[PDB]
Amino acid sequence: GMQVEQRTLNTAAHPFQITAYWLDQISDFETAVDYPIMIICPGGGFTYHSGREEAPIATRMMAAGMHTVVLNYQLIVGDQSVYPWALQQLGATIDWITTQASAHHVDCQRIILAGFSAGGHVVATYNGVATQPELRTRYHLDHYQGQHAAIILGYPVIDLTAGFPTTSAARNQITTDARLWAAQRLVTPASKPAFVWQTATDESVPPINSLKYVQAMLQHQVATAYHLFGSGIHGLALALNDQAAIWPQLALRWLQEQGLLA
Amino acid sequence: GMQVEQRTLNTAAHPFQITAYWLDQISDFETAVDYPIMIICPGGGFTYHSGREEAPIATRMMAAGMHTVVLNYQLIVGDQSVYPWALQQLGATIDWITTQASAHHVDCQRIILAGFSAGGHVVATYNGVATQPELRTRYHLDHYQGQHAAIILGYPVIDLTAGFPTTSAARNQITTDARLWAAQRLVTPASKPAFVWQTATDESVPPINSLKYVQAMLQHQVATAYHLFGSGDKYLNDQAAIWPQLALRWLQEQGLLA
Ligand SMILES: [Cl-]
């Protein structure tokens, strides 16, 4: 069982919506077991918030014994830019989770960020910025509590010059802050570990994006797994076990290896 | 059941050893089967031929229904170069397999090359050279019959300037033919499909080697997959059990197996 909580949060005068899915305890009368938590930054190419792939992933991750929160980060809608706002909102969401840690029994040493497509850009960029003191200051992230332990990236947008979006006017709408264009360029040995996956045949998000982030992580010897699946079927929305999608099985095992999951 | 055959073969005045592991036919009421075959180019940094990881891998793969041959390609031993000799030996080994195909029931439309570390350089370079008639001529492969359908690469050496060897004298010893240094640069749409992987327990070069090959394959629209579990034991044991499942699935997706 789970409790669903919808909220509208606000930071930096850019309100945003989240849904929390709080996993129930085995008993209300037992000493609490603090569960890890995954914060999901959806896809949607910075114009919408994808749910199609994200909802099944949330379900699967929870069945493994985790809480999940979906973060509907700033979009370009209504002639806005995404940054720096999305980074502040992700920071504010992590902070909010910490404030809920006793109420819903959240292990705040085991906060995992997961980003898909455009959300992958937000997460990957966060992973860089939030782990460098100078950049936290610059993007005002030192106002927030809590930190992530690791990230998961599925078909992430990583470099806004690498094919998505298709035009420079679109890139500059997302942000004119060129420092945030290329998330791989913000990787340092301080970046938290990452599990990255994509399909080789991806015609929506150019695969060069994940190759770029993985290169940089490996260059700085950050703990990293990367799975580029041969067939597009492995990237389809969810419904080794031959009867279930491969990638969640790999990600879960990786989280176990990283000490982030029982 | 299998039969083991040891041979010392010779091409280009550079002898080389192979061992072939020929899967037995079963007497049954299933239709005749010619089995695929995997040719293993071992690791060993061009100074030895590794068996420690290769042996159980050969064993796992044969259990999926394939023959295997192990090719002890040219090393730098005795003040020698690796190339072009290793490519010619691999070509010769494939030719040899075609001549043995009726005797052992080998599906020569399903020859799979598997290269580990330094042997990954041989296999990756071969996938590029042997699929281009002009480079076939240049490296005297025009002479040999048979062609591989796909390759597997474990933790491969791909670009002899991307970390290993650590010295120019070393690189030159492997080969002074700089066209052969960077296998990714020889990828074309004619290159065969490639499955690449590495587990955390694997000791090899920086994985940017693998990434560079895989990107080249993507750029030329050749089927490829890449499974990096980590770069550097219940969990490590498990990775060893998991990657072959992915390899075998991929081989099935490619029509190369069951
Ligand atoms: Cl959607």
* Type of residue numbered B29: F
| Alpha-carbon span B258 to B254, nearest angstrom | 10
Give the domain range for residue B137. Answer: 1-258
Structure tokens at B131: 């699929």
With 0-12 / 13-18 / 19 or more C-beta atoms within 10 angstroms meaning exposed / middle / buried, residue A12 is middle
Report CA dihedral (B181, B182, B185, B187) to the nearest 10 degrees.
100
DSSP B34: P
Long-range (24+ apart) CB contacts under 8 A made by B168-177 are B173/B76, B173/B81, B174/B46, B174/B76, B174/B81, B174/B82, B174/B83, B175/B81, B175/B82, B175/B83, B175/B84, B176/B81, B177/B83, B177/B84
| Alpha-carbon span B124 to B118, nearest angstrom | 10
Task: Give the end-to-end CA distance of chain B in Å, rounded to a whole number.
Answer: 19
Question: Where residue B149 sits, what CATH number does that domain have?
Answer: 3.40.50.1820
User: Is the preceding omega at residue B193 within 30 degrees of 0, hence cis?
Assistant: no
| Interface membership of A230 toward B (CB under 8 Å) | yes
CA distances to A32, A187, B136 from A102, rounded to whole Å, are 9, 33, 68
Element holding B93 (H helix, E strand): helix B85-104
| Alpha-carbon span B241 to A240, nearest angstrom | 9
Picking from A168, A38, A41, A153, the residue whose alpha carbon sits closest to that of residue A97 is: A38
The tally of CA atoms less than 13 A away on the side-chain side of residue A209 is 36
Phi–psi pair at A78, nearest 5 degrees = 65, 35
User: Is the preceding omega at residue A248 within 30 degrees of 0, hence cis?
Assistant: no
DSSP, collapsed to helix, strand or coil, labels residue B89 as: helix
Structure tokens at B170: 């070393």
Under 8 Å between Cβ of B156 and B121:
yes
B235/A256 touch (CB, cutoff 8 Å), yes or no:
yes
| Alpha-carbon span A67 to A24, nearest angstrom | 9
Picking from B246, B248, B242, B186, the residue whose alpha carbon sits closest to that of residue B217 is: B186
> CB neighbours (10 Å) of residue B16?
22
Picking from B51, B95, B101, B93, the residue whose alpha carbon sits closest to that of residue B71 is: B93
Under 8 Å between Cβ of A77 and A65:
no
CA distances to A48, A75, A86, B180, B236 from A15, rounded to whole Å, are 16, 11, 10, 56, 44
Under 8 Å between Cβ of A72 and A16:
yes
Q: Which of B159, B219, B249, B256 to mutate to test the interface with A (most CBs of A within 10 A)?
A: B249
**A134 conformational bin, left if phi > 0, alpha if psi -120 to 50, beta if neither:** alpha
DSSP, collapsed to helix, strand or coil, labels residue B160 as: coil
DSSP, collapsed to helix, strand or coil, labels residue B137 as: helix
Nearest CB to B229 within list A207, A225, A230: A225
Instruction: Tell me whether strands B14-23 and B2-11 are parallel, antiparallel or unpaired.
Output: antiparallel
DSSP string, A124-140: HHHHHHTTSHHHHHHTT
Where in B74-158 does DSSP place strands (E)?
A: 106-116, 150-154
Residue in the block written with tokens 């199609």: A52
Structure tokens at A17: 């919506």
Structure tokens at A174: 């997302």
| Interface membership of A218 toward B (CB under 8 Å) | yes
Alpha-carbon gap: A253 to the closest alpha carbon of chain B (Å): 8
Structure tokens at A58: 């949330």
Picking from B254, B1, B208, the residue whose alpha carbon sits closest to that of residue B104 is: B1
Resolution of the structure, angstroms: 1.7
Element holding A177 (H helix, E strand): none
| Alpha-carbon span A175 to A77, nearest angstrom | 13
The angle formed by the CA atoms of residues B115, B227 and A114, to the nearest 5 degrees, is: 165
Residue in the block written with tokens 């509208």: A8
| Alpha-carbon span B217 to B214, nearest angstrom | 5
Alpha-carbon gap: A131 to the closest alpha carbon of chain B (Å): 21
| Alpha-carbon span B45 to B205, nearest angstrom | 10
| Alpha-carbon span B192 to B79, nearest angstrom | 33
Picking from A108, A69, A104, the residue whose alpha carbon sits closest to that of residue A90 is: A69
Phi–psi pair at A57, nearest 5 degrees = -60, -45
| Alpha-carbon span A34 to A48, nearest angstrom | 33
B223/A246 touch (CB, cutoff 8 Å), yes or no:
no
Under 8 Å between Cβ of B157 and B121:
yes
A159-197: string of b/e by CB count within 10 Å (b at 16+)? bbebebbeeeeebebbbeeebbbbbbbbbeeebbbbbbb
| Interface membership of A81 toward B (CB under 8 Å) | no
Q: What is the CA radius of gyration of chain A?
A: 17
A214/B228 touch (CB, cutoff 8 Å), yes or no:
yes
Structure tokens at B93: 């080994």
Nearest CB to B225 within list A211, A218, A228: A228
Method by which the coordinates were obtained: X-ray
User: Which residues, including other chains, have CB under 8 Å from residue B178's CB and lie 6 or more apart?
Assistant: none
Alpha-carbon gap: B143 to the closest alpha carbon of chain A (Å): 33
B238/A253 touch (CB, cutoff 8 Å), yes or no:
yes
Picking from A61, A76, A62, A79, the residue whose alpha carbon sits closest to that of residue A121 is: A76
Structure tokens at A190: 């301080």
| Alpha-carbon span A171 to A159, nearest angstrom | 10
A46-82: string of b/e by CB count within 10 Å (b at 16+)? beebbeebbebbbebbbebebbbbbbbbbbbeeeebb
Structure tokens at B146: 């048979």
A225/B225 touch (CB, cutoff 8 Å), yes or no:
no
Identify the bridge partners of residue A69 per DSSP, sorted by sequence position: A20, A39
Residue in the block written with tokens 């005297």: B140
DSSP, collapsed to helix, strand or coil, labels residue A162 as: coil
Q: Which of A219, A226, A242, A246 to mutate to test the interface with B (most CBs of B within 10 A)?
A: A226
* Type of residue numbered B164: F
Count structural domains, chain B. 1
Phi–psi pair at A52, nearest 5 degrees = -60, -45
